[PDB]
Structure formats: C-alpha cells, structure tokens
Amino acid sequence: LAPRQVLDLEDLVFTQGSHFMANKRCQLPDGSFRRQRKGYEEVHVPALKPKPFGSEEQLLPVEKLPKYAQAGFEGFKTLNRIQSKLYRAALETDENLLLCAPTGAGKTNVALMCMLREIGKHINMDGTINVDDFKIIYIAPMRSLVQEMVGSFGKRLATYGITVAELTGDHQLCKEEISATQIIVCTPEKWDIITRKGGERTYTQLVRLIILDEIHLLHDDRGPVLEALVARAIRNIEMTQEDVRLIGLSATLPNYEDVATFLRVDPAKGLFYFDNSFRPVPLEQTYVGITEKKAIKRFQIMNEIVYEKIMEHAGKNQVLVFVHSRKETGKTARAIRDMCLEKDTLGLFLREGSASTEVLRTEAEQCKNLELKDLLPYGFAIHHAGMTRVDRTLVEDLFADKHIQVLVSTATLAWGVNLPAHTVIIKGTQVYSPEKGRWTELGALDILQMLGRAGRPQYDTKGEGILITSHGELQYYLSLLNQQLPIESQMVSKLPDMLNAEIVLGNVQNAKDAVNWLGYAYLYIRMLRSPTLYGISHDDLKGDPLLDQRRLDLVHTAALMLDKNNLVKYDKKTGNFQVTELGRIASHYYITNDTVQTYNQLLKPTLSEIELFRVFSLSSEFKNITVREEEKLELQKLLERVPIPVKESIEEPSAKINVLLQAFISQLKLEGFALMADMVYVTQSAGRLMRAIFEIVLNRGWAQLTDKTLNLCKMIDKRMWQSMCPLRQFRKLPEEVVKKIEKKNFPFERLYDLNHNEIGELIRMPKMGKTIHKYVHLFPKLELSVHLQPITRSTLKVELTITPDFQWDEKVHGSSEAFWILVEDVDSEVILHHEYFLLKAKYAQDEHLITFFVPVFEPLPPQYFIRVVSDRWLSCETQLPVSFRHLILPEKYPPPTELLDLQPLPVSALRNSAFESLYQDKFPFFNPIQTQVFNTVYNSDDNVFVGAPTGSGKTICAEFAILRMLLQSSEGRCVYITPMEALAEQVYMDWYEKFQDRLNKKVVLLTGETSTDLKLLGKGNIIISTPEKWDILSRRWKQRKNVQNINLFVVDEVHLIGGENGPVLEVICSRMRYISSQIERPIRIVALSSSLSNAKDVAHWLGCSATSTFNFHPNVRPVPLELHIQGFNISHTQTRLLSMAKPVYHAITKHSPKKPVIVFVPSRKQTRLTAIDILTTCAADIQRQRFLHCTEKDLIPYLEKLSDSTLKETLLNGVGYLHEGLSPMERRLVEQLFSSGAIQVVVASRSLCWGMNVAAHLVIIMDTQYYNGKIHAYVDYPIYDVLQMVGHANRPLQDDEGRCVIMCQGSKKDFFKKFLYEPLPVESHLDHCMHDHFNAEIVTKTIENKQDAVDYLTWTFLYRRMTQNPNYYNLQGISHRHLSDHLSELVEQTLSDLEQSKCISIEDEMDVAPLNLGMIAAYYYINYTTIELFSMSLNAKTKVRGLIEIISNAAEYENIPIRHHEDNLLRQLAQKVPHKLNNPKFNDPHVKTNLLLQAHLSRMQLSAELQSDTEEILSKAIRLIQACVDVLSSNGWLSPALAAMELAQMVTQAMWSKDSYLKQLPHFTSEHIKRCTDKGVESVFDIMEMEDEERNALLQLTDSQIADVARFCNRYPNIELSYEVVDKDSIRSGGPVVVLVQLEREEEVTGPVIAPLFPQKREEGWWVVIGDAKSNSLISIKRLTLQQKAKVKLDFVAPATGAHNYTLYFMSDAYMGCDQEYKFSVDV
Amino acid sequence: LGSMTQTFSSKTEWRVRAISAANLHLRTNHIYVSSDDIKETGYTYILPKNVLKKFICISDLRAQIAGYLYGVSPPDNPQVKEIRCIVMVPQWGTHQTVHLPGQLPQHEYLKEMEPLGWIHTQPNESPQLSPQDVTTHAKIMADNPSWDGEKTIIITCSFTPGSCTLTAYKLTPSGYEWGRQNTDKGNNPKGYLPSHYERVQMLLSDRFLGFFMVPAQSSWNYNFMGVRHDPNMKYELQLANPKEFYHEVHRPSHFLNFALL
C-alpha cells in the first residue's frame, strides 16, 4: 500500500483516439508497388493469395450438424471455411472464444452457432423451448448494425420461437418486452447503463451468452466501455460461480493474444486466427495520399482523382463512394455528374437506350426526393440519414437490380444493410466530431467496414478498394488495412468514471477491490505486455512484476479525482470508498464527474430558467465545443431574440450551447453545418443531463427548480415549449389545425366540457371538431380527492384518491402512463414528499389509493399542496390544495403514570409455596413496573391495563392475575390472546413448563380445529390462542357454555389493534365485554401493551378504572435504552444499502465490540450478503474472528449437519444468518450458537422479528423498507415491527445497557424519532373490516335489526376514538347526531353490501335475517366475498381441476409471493400437471396457491419456503372445501358436491383421484404399488386380508416400516353401514320421507387421522348424500363423525309417484377408498 | 464614410430586466421596515414574512406590481390587524401607478377576512405617498365601500439598495376626497398635499403564515400582454401560489414568435 504517488492521467492518455499507431514500421506484401502521380502518392497492393486447403479440410454439410440447430441454418448447405473450422468449438464446446477473421466473411454465423448451442440447452421434451429460462446478450457497435441484427436474427430464429428484439428509448418502463425477449441485441453503452442501474431479481441473472461483435473497438475511445463490461462479467461470474460464455469477434489485427487473454479464451481450444487470405473476394488495394496543403485545391484534386477512378470503372460493374456528411453525398454525386457532363463520358454509364434507364426514369417521379430525381437518371444515387426509409430501400433495390451504377453514401449504409459494390472509394478520411470540437480522422472501424463492403458475394471475381486521404496518415490506414495496427486500451482516459460505476455497484468498495477490477481490464493486459507504450519504466516493472504498485497508484489518482468532485468519499489510509448520491446519479445517467461537481456547485434552490440553461450549458461533455467566427453572425441573430435570456457574450461557447438548446426546443433550422452537428450533439446529450438535474433537485426537495427541470425535460423530448397548445404532442394531429387553434386565445382548459359543434364554432373549422374532441379527451388528466387522517398534533396521514378522468387508447398511452406526486409546503419551496405513480392499462379506469405521512405544526400552516405531473406528457398537470381550515387535531398526550421509587417487591409477597418456589428459582426481586402494579392484579378483581416498553416483563404481570384466578378456584379458566402465533408458542412452552409441570394445571394452545379447540377449552385452566382461533369459538358464545364460563381474559400486545389484523383483536375484546355484561358474572380483563399515548381510551374501552390503568414511557424500560438514528439519503434503495454496509461494522465496533449483535435486513439475500460484508470489513480494518468465541473444532460437529456451506463458513468466522429458507434444524442450530455466545453477530430477515427467541446487546436495523413482488414496489416497516425489532435489545441478567441503531432514509428520521422516543397513538381500522363480523352476528342472532347493529358498534374502540379524533374516521363533529348519522351510513352500507352479496336478507329495509350463504360464511370462518364468488362460479359445473381453481382464487389466499421466478419452472411442470390453463400470471398469489396445491397432490418435492406456503394453504384449504360442499349441497347438484368431497380426501392424503389407494400406506415406494398391481390387488384392506407372513413375503420391508404400515391399516376406517326406509311401501308423493342409516365402527380406535403429509392434526369425518346421478340432483345431505357407532336420519320431500334409486350416500373427508354405495327403490 | 463597419446589434429592455429580476431572492434577507415612531395611531398591522418574500420574488424592478390584502384581528385584541392573505389579480403596471381591474376579489375564503387595503412595489423610496397611490386608493374606496378609510392601508415596498424598505400609509378623509376628484396623472398634480395621508404601524413577523390567492383562469401578470387588460374585466380566484414575473405563461408570445422564424 503506502506510500503512493498521484499520476497525471491527462499525460498518460495517447490523445490519438483510435488513431494510435503503435507499430514502428509497415511491411508490404510481395507484388505491391508505389507510384507518384500529380502530387499524390499512390500505393498498390495485389491482395489475392487464397491458400486452397491446409492439411485436410472438408466442408461440413448441415446434415452432419446437430439436429436441433439445422433448421436455423435454413437456405444454406456448405459453411464457409472459417465456419467449418469453428463448428466444433461453437456447437460442441462451451468454451469462451475469440475469432479474428477478415471483415465480411460471415463472422456472425459463428455467433449464430453459439446462440443455437445455448438455445438447444433449454429445449424441453414438448418440442418447445424454456424461453423464460435463458437470455443471450449480443453487443453490436452501431445501432445501424443492431437493427439489421435484430431483424435477421429474428428471421433465422423465429422457427424456434425466440422473440428477438432490441431495447430502445427509456428503460424506466419498457420492461415487458425485456422479460419477453430471449436474445437482446444492443450497443455496448446501453448494456453498460443497464448493468449500472442493475438491481435484484433482474434478468441479468439469466444471461448465459454474451457476444462482443467488432471487438477491435477496444482501440476506439469507446473501447473502455467494452473493457468495463468484460471486467464486470468476469468478476461477477467469479462471485456467482455461474459460468457465462463470452464470444468475441474481431478483424485481422495484431495484439489478438492479449485480447484473448482479456476474454479468458484458451489459446489452443478457443483462439482461432485467420488472415486476410480468408477474405471472401480478393481486395485489390489502392491508397491515395495527397500532399496539396491548400484546401480549395485539395477539394478540386480529390474530386479529380475520384473522377479519374470512376472513369477507369466506367463500364465496370458498380462504384460506391463514401463521404462524411449527408450534404456531401449530394455534393460529390453532383460534382462527378457535372464533370461527366463537361466530357461525353456520361454516356458510358448508360446502356444506350436502356430498360434500366427506363426504370430509373420510371422511379424519377416515384422517388419524391429533391436530389434523387435529379441524380437517379444518370446512374447516380445517394444514401443518407435525412431520407425516407422507403426511398433508401428503393435506392438499395435499384443497386441490387444493378441499375444504380454509382452510389455515394454516408457510413450509416455501410453499417446498416448488405449492399456490396465492385469498387469502393473512400473520398477523404477526416470528419467533424462535435465532441472533440474539431475535424478528426476516421475511426478504424468505419474504415474497416466500408472497405469490407468492397467486392460482392458471387457477382464479382474480385473487389477493388481505393482510400483517399492525407499523405501523412497513409501509413496508418495501410497498417490498419494490412494487419499491422495493434489494438490498445484507452481506459486511462475514462478511468475515474468507470471506477465510480463500480463503486456505485458496490462491486468495488476498497482500493484493492479496484486493483482487482483493473486486473480484469484490457489496459492491465496491455500494460503487462508492452509497458513502454503505457509509460512504465522497465526497472519500474522489475519493482513490481505483477504491476501492483502501478495499478494501486492509478486507483489512488482516480479516487482522489472522484473525492475532489464530491462523487465519492475516499479514505486515504483505509482505502475505502463510500458511495454518495452524486456518484450514483453520475453513474446512472452517464454523466462524468466534473459535470456532476459543476451541477452540485451551481445548482441552488433559487435558480431561474436562465441560470438553469447556463448550468446545463457548462456541462463537461461540451467542453471542446467552441464558438467559431464562421457562425457568430447567425448566433448573434438568434441570441437577439432567444426566449430564455443569455447573459454572456456570444464569444463564450456557453452562449453557443445555450442558444443551440433553445433553438432545438423552438424547432429552428440553422444555416451553418457545424451548428447543425453541434446541435445534434448538445441536444441528444441534453436529455440524460436534464434528467440528472431533475433527480438532484427533486431528491433535494427544491420545488421550483424541480418543476422547471421536469418541464425542461418534457420540452427537450417533445420539441415544444409550454405556451404551445399541447395537442401537438399527439403527432397524429395536423400542424395547421393546431396553428388555427393557437390563434384563438381561449384556454385549452376551456374546451374540456365543451361539445363538438361548439368546439368547431370556436376553432372556425367545425366538421373535424369530433376528432379534436377525441384528441382533447385522449389528453391525460386525473382527479384527486384527499382524506386527511390526523395521527398526532405533529403528524398527518394523507389518503389521496387518484381517479382517471380520461379515455385510454393504446395507440397513444401505451401499456402505462407515468406521473409524479409532489406534496409541497405553504410557500411551494419545500417538497415534503414525492412519489412515482404508474397508471397501468390493467387499472386505467379504476381508482388509485396512495397514503403517505406529512409533518405539521402549531399554529397550523394555512395549506399544503399536491401536484400530479405527467412524467412525459407536457402541461398534463393536476394540482389539489389541502386546506387546514377544518382540521380537528387530537388532544395532547396525557402525562404518563409516574414510576415511583418503590421498594423492590420480594417473591414472598405471593405468600404461597409453589409460586414462591418458581419465582425464587428465577430471581429475588420483582421488576419495578411489576412492583408498582402488583397489588391491583393480585389483590383485586378489577380489569387492569399495563403499558410499558417491549421487554419490561409484562408477562409476569399477567401471570399474577392467572395465579389469583387459580387461588379463587383451582378449576378456573383463563384465556390468553396474543396476536402472533410464533409468540404464542414461546408463551406455550414457558407457561406449560410453569403451570402444568409445577402445578398440575392445564395449559392448552389452540390449533384452529373447532372440535380440538373446544376440547382444549373444556379441559384447560390456561388456554393460549391467537385472535382468530378465539373469534371463531367465542362467536357462538350462546351455544358454547365453555365460552361463558371463562373467568379471566388476558390480551398481550393490544396496541396491534392498529395493525393489519387489528380488527379481530378489537372484536374479540369487545365480545368479552358484551358477554361479561350479559351473563352478569364479571369476566376480568387484563391488557398488556407497549406504551400508548392514548392508553386511557383503551382502558375505558375495557372497563379499566383510572386507578387500574398503568401507562409508562420508554425511559422506564428495565434495561436502559440507547437509541441512535442514522440518516442515509440515497433515494435508490440498493445503493442506500451499499452505503449502509460499512457503517454496520462501524456501529458494531463502537457500541458492541464484545457483546452480541443482531442485525435486521430487509430480505433473505441481504442476510448472507451483510454477513459476508461484516466479515470482509473485519478482515480489512482490524482482524477477523473477533466474533468466534467457541473453538472451531468444538463446533464442527454441530456445524457439519448444516446445509449451506456459506452458512458453515460464516459461522466458523463467527456470523450467522436467519432467513425463511433455512430449514428448522439449521435455524435452531444458529439460534443455539447465538444464545451460547459462540457466534457474535446474527443477520436476520425482517419477517422473523416475531419468531426470534434470542436477543442481543445491540440491534442494528437496516433500511426499514422491503420490496413487494405483488405491487412490485417498496413498503415501509410498520412502527410495530420496528418496536419489536428494537425490543430485541433487552439482555437483562447480562447487560447494563441496551443499544439500537436504526439506519433509515433522512426523510423518515423525524417520524421515527417522533414515534420511538414517546408513546404511540393507536386507532381502529374496524370501520373497513366489518362485513364478516356483521354477517356472523346476524347468524348468531346477536344482531337482529339495524338498530341492534348500531348497538353492537357502541361497544367498540372505534366509538371511543370517534369522539376523540373524528377526522381519522372521516367524521366532522363530536355531537351525538353526527355519531348516529355516521353509524347509520356505515351500518346501511355494510348491510346492503351483505344483502347484495346474498349473505343476509333485508325485510322492509329495516330488519335483517341470515341467508344460507351468510351461514356458510360464519360457520366455516370464511370471508363473504369468497362465498359470493363461490356461489356465482360453481353452478352445477363439476370439475376437480376447476374446483382447485375456484378454491385458489378465494380471497383468503391474497398473500405470500416474492421473487420466485421458479414458479415458471413449476409452471413448466404445471404444464405437465393436469391443469396448465389460464394465462400464466406468475407473481399472482392464487396462481401460486393452486400451483403449490397441485404439486402437493402429486407428492412433488419443492423448496422449504414453498413448503411453509403449502402448509398454510392446506389448512385454509380443507375449511374452504367444506364450505364448497355445503354450498353445492344447499342448492347445487350432486356430481359437484361429490367431486368436492373427493378433493377433500385427495388433499388429505396428497393423492390424485387416479392414483392407487395403496399410495396411502407409509414407506410404500412406487415400485411397491407396482408390485401390488402386478398381483392386480389394489384394495386398501386387501393387505389386511393377507397373512402377515404372506404380506411380509411380498412387501420386503423393515420392522419399523411395517409397524407404521400396520398402524395405518388399523387406523384405516372400515365401518358397517345399514340403510333402512321407515314405512317404505307406505309413502306419499307430497309427504316427506325419512331414511335411516346406522353406522358402526368395527375397530373402535381413538386417535387422529393418520396423514403425515397433512400439516395440522385432523379427525375422521363422513358424509351421507341422497341423490340420483341420472338426474344429477342432490336431495338429502348430512355430515357426521363416527366415534363408537351412531344412527342418522335424512329427511327428504318425496317426488311424484315415480320409481327412484336409493343413490350413493357414503363419502369421506380424509381417507380415500372408504366410499360405499347401497341402492334400493320403493314407490308411493 | 467609405466601407465603414456598420451594423446595429442590441437586445430588448425586458431581457436586461429579466436577468436583473433573477436575483430578487437576495433582497429578502435584508428587508427593513420604517417606523417614524410618532404615529401612535392605534391600529397595528402585522405582515407575515412568507407572503412578502413571495411578493418580492415575483416582482420587477421597473414595472410595479400590486396585491390586495385580506386579514382579520387576533382573538382578544381588536386593535391589531394581522394581514393573512394576499390576492394577486390581473394587472399591468408602470413605474408610477399600477392598473388593476375594477372588480375587487370575491371568493369563499375571503368572506371571513376583512379587506385591509393593498400592497405594491416601488422602484424609488420617495419619502411621501404617491399622488397616483392616493388617487387609486380613493377611487377603489369610492367604487367599493368594503374599504373603510381607517382600516385600509397602502403598503409600499421600496427597492432600496440591495434591500427592500416597507412603509405603511392610511388615507385621511381629505385624501379620499382629493383622490376621488383627481383626473390628472402628473407627478405633482392639482391639490396634492401631505396631510392627505398618514403613517400607520406596520410589523413584520414570522410567527404565523399567510397564503396567496391567484386568479383561476389566467395568472396575474398581464404586463407582457397589456392589450388583453380592460379595467371592466372580471376574474375568478383560486388557492394557489403566484408565478414568477418572467414565467413562460406570462409571455407566450416571446416563445411562439421566436418559433415561427
């Protein structure tokens, strides 16, 4: 490392561009010769020289090629010689390759071969191809080339079904085709910007083949881009261990060995070198080097030599001249034609009176070009950019028709299409490059391509190429075109910028990372091979043979450059790079560092449009732009009337650039050609630069500058100003009609609501007004209403309802439209919040609900403002004021209850033996909060509330009341409700081990199974349950005597009433108060929570006295709490995480050097990546293994059972990570290692903040945002998650302190502070979630009329908050009539939504009753909208697959998906599973649910996360299928109900209806059931029939396996069924009939249903169904369990005097193959 | 003279005035308010800083701009009057007087607040209230009786060097009569005398915040299109913030014309 030295990169740059001539001489081929003619020296090269064949070369017919790739090579048979040499390495090896072949020669066919190899990899059995699985990247140097590449690649590869396309325009939203495309052709810089932005879940992961065409561009000044890409790809391959193939194509140039080293191409296997001999046609070479130094004479001489050469080819095939500009094609064609007219030589091109001249005359009127009709008849033609594509194709067709005898073209033709000519002449090799501010020589690639266009496939025996240029540059153009031009790196010029690109990516984060990165660059290779050219002394090279010191010095210089410009914070000692927002913006908009420093210095919030134009003008991309004399007059004529003022004089090029931009926006044509070129440069570059200024000033919250910059972006794009009538933006509207509209000063606004004829009268052109109307309504516009939700006296939550008020036409609006939402302060200076809003076509009509938080203060600011501005559509702006005239602000938080300095309460205060015993085993004194509250819980019967930080010991407080209840009666029942099940299990373990093990009391954790839970509540003294498990039970409180006999109700984390699941908590808690009032026996209520600012509201809601409610403050936490909030301001999430990487290490070594540390990260991938980052920073800054505290070998036993080698290594170094995908044993082992202190740091996913049982001294929360795959957007951590994560910093019996660092975006800092230092207000969301509760209460008759519904709502927390914060619930007033009217509206709306959903029935618009759909809803605890969709979809239609689809699309499953493109893989196998239908909406929850379900039925092996998904889906599944059975029985037909029962049993045993029943037997392989079916025996109890010796002979199984099988054979239900008809012969048609069925279990075993593949435990169930299959009519259904024996009777109204069968009753709900049927018949 | 180099190259005046007005945000931190300290009237006016900073940021140094003032009295103190809103109306101005519509502002928000007068810019800090200002205030008083002479003021924001000095005036009855009778626009016209006005107390504050109301259809700067301004024109208002002086919406011609050639 130190000491280093700073280099002058400017001096190290060759400053020759691609014109660097590293060769010192130039040898010529034998036969060549040199002449001198008229002042120009002519060099002649014979070329020719095609070696017939080597040792043994035989061309390969396509028939010998692999079958899969033959069809792509349609229309050809014999590959060229190079192709036949490379067929092996291209289609039979996966090696990276570099092919140096002469230009032309079809070097792209080998790339096609490699592409076909990678295509054949992903071919599946169906004949189709896993198109979604792979992506190939093709890198062409010119967009001209890219378009033809896309076309031809699609044409040749359409047969395999690949969508071949290039990506264009803005990459922000055009990503649908990106997923759709399988081959992506693009320019190197577009790929660079893409990979720069990057991201996770990108398609860059699926990229397996990259093809770098025309790679000799490495010599060009664009070369460093190719270098950056290849270095990036190799480094990322190394990191991913996923090898990616690189295929390089170059010309016959030296230094090819170093280029192969660049591409990791093995010389023997991968390197294939061919010379110019393998050119398709011999290229007779003439090089003309002129010496005349007068410009006028040079022009005349160049025209003279061109004329001489064209006349030497007067009768020859064709002549193709190339010139620099578009007007110069016309000039040169006109010059040669006029020189032909001065002579009589013109007649030599024409074939006398030709039919071809007749064709050129035929298209004289058809060409519709001013130059073309003048020059086409004489055989002349031109090709340039400013030309119709049809006209260009017509010129190409006449040249292919051989009619056009002379063609003059810009290089765009040379790159674009396949247009060969016999003779090709390059008229000059100098061209104006607006970047350089000068005329520079031609890029070697352009020259190589043009002169490769000389000769033709078969029409010519030989081609001839003439190159006219200066005499000095002759040698260079010789050595390039005869293989003596070395290829060198130009990275030194661009090194700082490139480095920033990699720092922003995080790929580089220290100087040594950058030295590695540079090692993968072509610059390093070339420095190692030729140190002389790159300024490295030979003894200097001896000093460090690997060039470590030189690379490190280069990196140090670049880092110092970036730190100067404030892009990157660089630490000299460490060598560390910290990315900043400026550096990211520079990398992400292709801005160089000097430009960004300029922007940072100049840009102030008070800039005007004048100053903003100047700031753009001072961009370092325009540094070489100069004001020349030849143009100053025109520039002065413009600057005299520019709309945006220009302060400086016209001599300063700043003024030139400013004026040129203004002229581009005003759409002006300039006379000077240098002006046209410099405008092209300035404007094409201006887009990204202005977007960069936009993100700067926006993320800086400067409102005015943000507006101006966005509008300037829209103006640069749409080529108009604001004042212009925006209709011109359509591009389908005439210009003159818009002019006539502009003349009228009636605001376009004022023609919105106007009808067509009035519009026409206003324009004065009425007939077309309808069209205007259409294009008036196609103009985007939105409608915004605002719901203000006061959170606190300082914080407001805002719900914006965006409703589209335009018509969506895909021809105009595309797939999506984009808007920016900006909240602005009173004086429109400060952007309080901004947000990007994408209106997609899927919801182009529907409303859009956006909720955000804005601060406020007292006295109230008059208004805020909400502007919505279209990102691309101009003047499409809709602004909404937000007035606080009528804002009702909540009362201030009451002072918290004081924590008195009371004497610590010993355990002896319980005054009971076993109580004292346990709590002396654990401690000698009580927590001070426990101490303060002890008397009220232990020595009173009142309801009590406790509020204190998470980690204060609230559980012991509740245990006190449990103990007092047990003392008052040892048979009493307590119900403990906690909102999270993963916390319920912690409570269950601890409280079983306590109460049950030490007191012979009962502790039962409810399961959700109705009968299991009712038993557990009957037998239990302490019943732990989640809210929903208690809701479903307590609903039937009238029919449940156990629910009424409850004595104590404890509820933990009650603040979670303000969360997503809050409503069910609030509902059960109000249910307990209503029940305690009704039964007159008091049910005591104990509530534990975090500190609540409005704790008194909840206490009153629960009947807690003022003396019983205890609300504390986060300073009273037993363990003292140190909180630090660190703001990171990068808007880009991923880069923000990178910026937070190293400060995690810093916070560890500052706050918790030796004590344990827990880090919380937003996603599972971030767990492992942050662990690796911790270990890397630790290795670099001090020493690793500061985390390990147990000997590595003492942990190797525990370690070797783990699955992830990454996890075992990081654990070895002392850091473990927790994510959903870890198997339970792995998670248990990591948490065990953490509690043991063996591992110091644990990096854990956010989702585990409830599940984790461990704790640490320090808690480091990263980011506080997570990606949603559903919305495809980031969501904030709710405050409750944050509180729990912070509560993890509670180590009581080990640490004196508890420290937590929350790393958040700057904007959130305040909010977090505001709501983490002080108690938290909570409010009810029950007003939204209410329909299912109302329907259930209508079922259980708790609610009978609408007045009873309002009565019901009186008991809620909602009522308490509505009088305290009305605006939060959209109320306006605290009076009693306001409340009654609001409740009236709410009850009417909920009940009418119920009635229309058919769950209830409203009579006289007053009284309500429950229908059967509502009964099936409340019975099975199912959302009513599920029931509605079920009722509408089922009908009499019976499909097992359709049934799975109906169940999946139920509203309950709208959860779980994230990333998981492996569903695609499942989709492939879901193409195999019985149902592949519906369009493949991956990322849709219901799709994932039925996919996982159908995988489960086929006993398919999936991932672990997918298995958890499966578990939850399965539980809610069986309850839904029972609902479906009851629906199909209530009024449906017979076959669908029967199929639903079959689906229930199919789900239980993970069996398909076709599978053999023997698949239910444990330890039974598929070969085993094949053996049994070879016996033909398939009956499930046939195994029971065989003797155990005989069954043992057939099975060949292990005694434990046979024991499991025997338990199942015994548990398998075999029942005796008896059917009977009372009074059978004496029945009546009108009268009812009862059929009696008696069922008796023969075995009479007790236990659950044996289904290991089923998640929860389940009991036997059975169905009985009267109904004929001939008529598909179900008559009489009844379900029942068969414990012991039982009789059942089915009532059914008889038909009319007709014979009928006695049907197919018996059906199961679990075991498959137990289904019976008995038939009979009797008439009336 | 034989063959002498001759060509006129010049720019319009509004170019220079725009380049000048771009730096108006600077004068906002140095804003002084003049108090003779002998007024002792009783009626005290409190002007919030935000609306004044936006008023100054949008003005021009040469051409004058004006805004109407609406405000109420604080809860307990009738003697105090807190300017709480500035209404910008379509106007066109010269360096002496500002031409305003005959229609006074009318909106729902303004129904609860009192018309407290008007405020206008001034390029020179003349030590007396302009005769044009007296005439305009008296004519506005006579045509609309919503402006009581004792509760309406003329606030003058004078463009002092690198700053802006405020001073507030109220008309006296003789001033009302002379301003109703005056049809002369001279700088020292008939019957002008300093006893026609009196100095009232103005206060700058940042304790409370004020808001702007701008016309809903067109903006306020008709200066660049003085033709479209007729004193009998009628406007509707909205809750928004006023655009800068040289905003493109104020001068559409300067863009369209430059586009046509």
Ligand SMILES: O=S(=O)(NC(=S)S)c1ccccc1
């Ligand atoms: O109830 S919230 O409005 N959450 C949703 S968006 S469901 C809320 C309020 C305060 C802190 C965290 C969360």
